[PDB]
Design a protein around this nucleic acid. Structure first.
Ligand SMILES: [Mg+2]
Ligand SMILES: [Mg+2]
Ligand SMILES: [Mg+2]
Ligand SMILES: [Mg+2]
Ligand SMILES: [Mg+2]
Ligand SMILES: [Mg+2]
Ligand SMILES: [Mg+2]
Ligand SMILES: [Mg+2]
Ligand SMILES: [Mg+2]
Ligand SMILES: [Mg+2]
Ligand SMILES: [Mg+2]
Ligand SMILES: [Mg+2]
Ligand SMILES: [Mg+2]
Ligand SMILES: [Mg+2]
Ligand SMILES: [Mg+2]
Ligand SMILES: [Mg+2]
Ligand SMILES: [Mg+2]
Ligand SMILES: [Mg+2]
Ligand SMILES: [Mg+2]
Ligand SMILES: [Mg+2]
Ligand SMILES: [Mg+2]
Ligand SMILES: [Mg+2]
Ligand SMILES: [Mg+2]
Ligand SMILES: [Mg+2]
Ligand SMILES: [Mg+2]
Ligand SMILES: [Mg+2]
Ligand SMILES: [Mg+2]
Ligand SMILES: [Mg+2]
Ligand SMILES: [Mg+2]
Ligand SMILES: [Mg+2]
Ligand SMILES: [Mg+2]
Ligand SMILES: [Mg+2]
Ligand SMILES: [Mg+2]
Ligand SMILES: [Mg+2]
Ligand SMILES: [Mg+2]
Ligand SMILES: [Mg+2]
Ligand SMILES: [Mg+2]
Lengths: 79, 85, 204, 66, 87
RNA sequence: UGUACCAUUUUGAAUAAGUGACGACUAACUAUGUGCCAGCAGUCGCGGUAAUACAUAGGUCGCAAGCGUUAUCCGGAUUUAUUGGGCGUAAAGCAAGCGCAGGCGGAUUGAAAAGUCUGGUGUUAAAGGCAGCUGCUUAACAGUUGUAUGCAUUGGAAAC
RNA sequence: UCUGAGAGUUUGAUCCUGGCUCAGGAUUAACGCUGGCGGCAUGCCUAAUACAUGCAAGUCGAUCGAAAGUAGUAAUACUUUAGAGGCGAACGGGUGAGUAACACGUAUCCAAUCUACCUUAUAAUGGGGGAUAACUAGUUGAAAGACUAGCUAAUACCGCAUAAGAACUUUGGUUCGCAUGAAUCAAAGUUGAAAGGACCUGCAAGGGUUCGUUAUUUGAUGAGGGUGCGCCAUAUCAGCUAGUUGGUGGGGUAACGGCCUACCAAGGCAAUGACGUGUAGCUAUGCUGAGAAGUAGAAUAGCCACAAUGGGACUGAGACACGGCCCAUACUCCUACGGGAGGCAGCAGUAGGGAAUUUUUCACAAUGAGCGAAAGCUUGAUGGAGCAAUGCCGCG
């Protein structure tokens, strides 16, 4: 009632979930810090983290695009 | 350039008592499946008076569909001939 | 699959297999409908359905056909161009076993079916195993060989009595045929054209 | 097998029904008795066939005399 | 991932194929996009009435043949035009 | 799969016919038994001691490796009638009136072209439908080529 | 060039209105009698009832460590695979429960989208680090396993240098659009890649083919959304709707959107039938009809929905996943009583219901799929063979 492919697939995705959850958390903490003490310096780090996740697929590529556009809107308004 | 052309609908405004809205009604003469006679129908589409168009009640308005701005609103007003009421 | 009392059905309708061998017989020269109830009154005035069914049986008993085969053949010929009153007569007369008896190589029609069923006949360029193949005028239906020596070839080789619509070409047994049968070679045993309308009601 | 009670005529001369038995009803409608609209197929299950019959046996259910 | 491949529509003991452009995930004997031409395992000669028209469009487009499908192209000579048109 | 098929291979009619009906619609009738009893029945209806309608028997009919019965759908049914019905006496004109919405509606001129008509293009998957042809001993069947219907867009017609 | 058959029956007898019945086809058919064979096709319509047992998706050593076996004095040669990794398991197969609405058919707009492998074209494939499966040892057990500590490998993972082009903005031009708005620059800023394997040549150095990889470009297929029209019965169902209608800023979704949020308002649908009830997968089509159309949605084919019931989510290009995961409910089973196991609406088959519908079969040989360079490998899809006059056709 079980398939070796399915069991192995379940065991691998747990480890994948650990690494990907960490990476998503990295993006989350940087953008909250950024918008906290607004500073053009941080913005860059946000760019690096958002683009890296999008290539790996962890985050949908469209999400990197919308986040990038909206954070730049705040800076132009504030600068 | 070559740009696919949108569908159009001709109607009359029935009422307007919200912010930026105009409940228009478009008629048609669909044939009957069996007795083969034209039948007048009535259906009330909604559109938005974003600006420059106003189109208060009683205003004969042309309608072009658009990307859904909200639920049950997918149309926009256009040129107005016979501006009255 | 056939009746074994051909005298009985031939005596009722009145028409035999066109030589009166089943009507003349060697006894009593009986020309009455069979059974005890044969010599009675109330003879004519058969209803249109009554005469049509009796006549329909006549056509399909002259050739050894099952009614379902009849419906199939009628459905085939019906649709084409128009008044096809010349085609279905050729189609009904195009049966392989019918042609072999008319070929003059068999004493009787249903005996020819046995020879056909037993494989003693060859078509133009192939053999025959089924006694229902629809033929077309032009095929050299050459006779078999291992059958020209059997103790029954005597009346078979006497094909000098033959209908004009078949160029048997005996000896060489070319076995071709042409010049499709006119109504003259289809005697008054079954000569009518309202059976087509009867099947028109029964068969769409 | 459902929950409907129907009065069904036993088509034949003689029956083995004993108030408690199983029958395999069919369709019909006897014109003499008002209300009856079904017939019991004879010689199938617990109900016996109709012997002493040589005519139209296929309907009443009797083994070919042979 | 269009793939020119076959589809059985014969009867018991009598197969009958048709060269046809279809997607991989579509069932065999299912939906297809364009018709190329039919085939018969026992037609003796001319066994593959090819089209030579849309087939070149789909192969240039990137249609993926099969092992037996490719085979058919070679006896007629369809592989030659495709490879020389690539060049 | 030693399968389809083939052969002058041995034996040999040898291994193979049932079902419904016979009063009319509906092709096909007599005797025996029973005597409003036993029973038949799709409809009219048969049986009360001379039953071609029941039972049995003989004959005969309609079919055939199938035949009857039952169930369901369509036709016949112009019997919900757009094509294609009616409302005095047979079912059916509200007890009568004022009447909005709806349906219909005098004559002439102009424009537009929503109906209406027409040309071009796209599409309406394949199988099925009809025609022709091929292949299976012909057929059933399979393949093959042809074969519409509607929708949208565009270009004209102006009689209603 | 289409193209249509009637009769019996109210009366003492007649005409008309009018209902009933019959003559014809047809089915996923069943029953009774009987019964020889062959060519095609069909075969749980009921209990989306519960299921014994056996099969129905794996593949690559030419990604990687290790282990084992056979030869060999050794170096090593060959074979095999538990495990790490890549890819496929979302395809294919079945059922029609739910669903009366953008579900479906048709025509469309996506200036509001995705697309792994595949097509074309264009730049790169350099250099480091830290880990854990397998293994060893210990605890706990009959075993499934589980926990703890060390040891390793990479096309697993994580940094770094580097951008032909990309992505995000800035500067003004261009061409403009259908209202939001797109389209193209030149300059600049900001941000961002990976992995090697097999083989040949070469003393070497180096070079090369091919597979594979990162960044792009072209299309195409596939997926998703919106819209017009068509698509059941019922008024002995007249009001329904409070995220329901609209705006604002923000959040979220591949994308637009009360999809979500806070504020501001009170609208929207409805006698041209809302809402409610009952029923039903829709369509191409099957049967029937001269036709208009009536009827069923067999088989098969498209789309949708479902996987004991009800929810949630990971991985992934794609699932909220039939034979993957988590939780609850119901049901069954095993136990050594602590714990567990389970989903035939996949192929057969069993029990039960029914008037009634089949092998607990053979082979991947052909077609089709997944992985692989090939060898191959896996394929109850598929192709055959059983069974049944179930239907058409044919012969005795
Ligand atoms: Mg993802
Ligand atoms: Mg608006
Ligand atoms: Mg009787
Ligand atoms: Mg009698
Ligand atoms: Mg009728
Ligand atoms: Mg009618
Ligand atoms: Mg009338
Ligand atoms: Mg009256
Ligand atoms: Mg009056
Ligand atoms: Mg009155
Ligand atoms: Mg008045
Ligand atoms: Mg009025
Ligand atoms: Mg007028
Ligand atoms: Mg079609
Ligand atoms: Mg066919
Ligand atoms: Mg009378
Ligand atoms: Mg009838
Ligand atoms: Mg292994
Ligand atoms: Mg699936
Ligand atoms: Mg199947
Ligand atoms: Mg089913
Ligand atoms: Mg249902
Ligand atoms: Mg992939
Ligand atoms: Mg390394
Ligand atoms: Mg870097
Ligand atoms: Mg890597
Ligand atoms: Mg809003
Ligand atoms: Mg009619
Ligand atoms: Mg179906
Ligand atoms: Mg079904
Ligand atoms: Mg399962
Ligand atoms: Mg799975
Ligand atoms: Mg099963
Ligand atoms: Mg189930
Ligand atoms: Mg295979
Ligand atoms: Mg049969
Ligand atoms: Mg037959």
């Amino acid at each position: 009632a079980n398939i070796k492919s399915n069991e192995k697939r379940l065991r691998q995705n747990i480890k994948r979930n650990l690494n990907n959850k960490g990476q998503k958390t990295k993006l989350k903490t940087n953008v909250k810090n950024f918008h906290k003490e607004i500073n053009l310096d941080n913005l860059g780090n946000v760019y690096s983290q958002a683009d890296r996740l999008a290539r790996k697929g962890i985050i949908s590529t469209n999400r990197a695009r919308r986040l990038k556009s909206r954070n730049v809107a705040v800076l132009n308004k504030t600068q | 350039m070559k740009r696919n052309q949108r569908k159009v609908l001709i109607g009359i405004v029935k009422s307007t008592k919200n912010a930026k809205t105009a409940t228009v009604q478009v008629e048609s003469r669909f044939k009957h499946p069996l007795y083969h006679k034209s039948v007048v129908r009535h259906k009330k589409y909604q559109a938005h008076n974003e600006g420059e168009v106003l189109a208060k009640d009683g205003d004969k308005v042309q309608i072009v569909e658009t990307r859904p701005l909200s639920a049950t609103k997918r149309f926009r007003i256009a040129k107005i001939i016979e501006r009255a009421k | 699959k056939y009746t074994g009392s051909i005298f009985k059905r031939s005596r009722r309708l009145g028409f035999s297999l066109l030589e009166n061998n089943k009507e003349f017989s060697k006894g009593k020269k009986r020309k009455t409908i069979p059974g005890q109830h044969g010599n009675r009154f109330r003879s004519s005035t058969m209803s249109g359905y009554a005469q049509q069914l009796q006549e329909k049986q006549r056509m399909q008993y002259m050739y050894g056909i099952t009614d379902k085969q009849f419906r199939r053949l009628f459905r085939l010929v019906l649709k084409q161009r128009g008044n096809l009153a010349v085609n279905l007569f050729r189609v009904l007369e195009s049966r392989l076993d019918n042609i072999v008896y008319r070929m003059g190589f068999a004493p009787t029609r249903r005996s020819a079916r046995q020879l056909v069923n037993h494989g003693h006949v060859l078509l133009n360029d192939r053999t025959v195993d089924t006694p229902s193949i629809i033929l077309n005028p032009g095929d050299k239906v050459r006779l078999k060989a291992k059958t020209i020596k059997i103790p029954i070839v005597k009346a078979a080789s006497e094909s000098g009595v033959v209908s004009p619509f078949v160029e048997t070409n005996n000896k060489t047994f070319e076995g071709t045929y042409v010049r499709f049968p006119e109504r003259s070679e289809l005697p008054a045993g079954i000569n009518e054209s309202y059976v087509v309308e009867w099947y028109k009601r029964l068969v769409k | 097998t459902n929950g409907f009670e129907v009065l069904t005529y036993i088509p034949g001369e003689g029956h083995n029904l004993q108030e408690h038995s199983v029958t395999l009803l069919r369709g019909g409608r006897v014109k003499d008795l008002p209300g009856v609209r079904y017939h019991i197929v004879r010689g199938t299950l617990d109900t016996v066939g109709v012997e002493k019959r040589r005519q139209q046996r296929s309907a009443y259910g009797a083994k070919k005399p042979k | 991932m269009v793939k020119i491949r076959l589809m059985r529509m014969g009867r018991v003991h009598y197969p009958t194929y048709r060269i046809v452009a279809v997607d991989s995930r579509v069932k065999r004997d299912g939906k297809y996009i364009a018709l190329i031409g039919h085939l018969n395992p026992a037609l003796k000669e001319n066994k593959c009435k090819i089209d030579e028209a849309v087939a070149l469009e789909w192969l240039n487009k990137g249609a993926k043949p099969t092992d037996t499908v490719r085979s058919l192209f070679s006896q007629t000579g369809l592989w030659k035009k495709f490879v020389e048109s690539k060049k």
